[PDB]
Design a protein around this ligand. Sequence first.
Ligand SMILES: C[C@@H](NC(=O)[C@@H](C)NC(=O)CCCC[C@H](NC(=O)C[NH3+])C(=O)[O-])C(=O)O
Length: 345
Amino acid sequence: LPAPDDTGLQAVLHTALSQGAPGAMVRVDDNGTIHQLSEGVADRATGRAITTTDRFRVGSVTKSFSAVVLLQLVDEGKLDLDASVNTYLPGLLPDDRITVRQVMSHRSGLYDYTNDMFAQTVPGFESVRNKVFSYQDLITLSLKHGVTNAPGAAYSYSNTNFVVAGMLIEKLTGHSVATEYQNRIFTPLNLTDTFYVHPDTVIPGTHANGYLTPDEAGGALVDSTEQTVSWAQSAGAVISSTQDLDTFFSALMSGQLMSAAQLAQMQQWTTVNSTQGYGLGLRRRDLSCGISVYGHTGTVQGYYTYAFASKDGKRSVTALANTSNNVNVLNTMARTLESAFCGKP
Ligand SMILES: C[C@@H](NC(=O)[C@@H](C)NC(=O)CCCC[C@H](NC(=O)C[NH3+])C(=O)[O-])C(=O)O
């Protein structure tokens, strides 16, 4: 791989701030050599500076944790990816042919209930921030709509899929997702900055506060830091740090979290767009310099996360901007991948 470009990374962060991110930061673990940069504030009212050690809400990076647990259950013989979801969760879905593999790769056709919840950004956030939902509550919300397409038809993102994933994990193991993440991933990898505290609203330790950008251009930002994230749970409630996500994705890609066979299934790509694929709770992004990286993006109110690693896990990158509902910042932060993996032009 070419050398990571710190000057380019510095510019990306600086640009994100110019676009509305109170703070932005990135950490690269380049085969044992660390690159770390940050600019801006963790708390815009107090002015405390953001740092690469600040904890944050990783959004759907959570999906990769959920998929890891499920694939270990496959290795253990407790789950068959091609078995129907209704086999393990009787009567849950109206189609007894929607499979676990389809749900894990967003090819189930299940309607995404969050499209209803967040039609309006801030009102939607105020509506769910302090709510506690059961997994079934969420599935029911989804099922009120018809499916959007035939199972296995094509990739269509839906948080409902990983809500089902969490329900499967708890049913098959008889434990909470928190317990499973801890025993199967957090402890083994010693991810000391990683937690799943749902429905607690507090983020443990020093963290970056999240700032939700309202739908109205120029509108005042909303501190969205403390919420239950119950609308996502196994689809997006994990809290972590740049160091911990780098360790996790490097461990995943270097083959330390499941059998070679299950990692292969995890990387069977379904087309998302011309430069992206989705496997099982895992995203593939193709960079301009012809390099593909693996991991996941995350969006939780006030937090945009990119956490990706090279195919062999030797280089990993995690970037975070503490604002959300700001496409300019979202697009800009994606450039950290180009600077970190592709290097200087
Ligand atoms: C992107 C990532 N998905 C996630 O991380 C999941 C957990 N988050 C969402 O589906 C976004 C919820 C709305 C956020 C809100 N948007 C609105 O409110 C829009 N009205 C915001 O930007 O904070 C993935 O699929 O890889």
